[PDB]
């Protein structure tokens, strides 16, 4: 009954034993080990810098 008003909330999360991952795929899911963007982004045997 004597709860204070103006209570601000906050959220967080914790992941342990987990590397975040970003796959190099078209629809971001595993359709194969040799992925599908590994044959047409690298296209006509070209080179691309990255940062």
């Amino acid at each position: 009954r004597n709860a204070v008003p103006n209570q601000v909330t906050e959220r967080k999360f914790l992941v342990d034993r987990y590397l975040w991952q970003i796959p190099f795929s078209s629809n971001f899911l595993n359709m194969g080990t040799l992925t599908d963007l590994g044959q047409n982004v690298m296209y006509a045997n070209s080179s691309h810098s990255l940062n």
Partner: protein, 50 residues
């Protein structure tokens, strides 16, 4: 998987809302263009309130 610029997720805001003492209406407009598919198994609501 195509090359064209289309969106993986989707976010649609409601066209009409309605308030009551005891309910809340939300009416949406799900536009699926030509050469698109969507399964409604991935459909859900995103409620923000207090």
């Amino acid at each position: 998987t195509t090359d064209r610029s289309q969106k993986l997720q989707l976010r649609v805001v409601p066209i009409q809302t309605e308030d009551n003492v005891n309910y809340y209406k939300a009416r949406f407009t799900l536009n699926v263009g030509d050469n698109r598919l969507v399964d409604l198994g991935s459909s859900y609501f995103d409620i923000k309130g207090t």
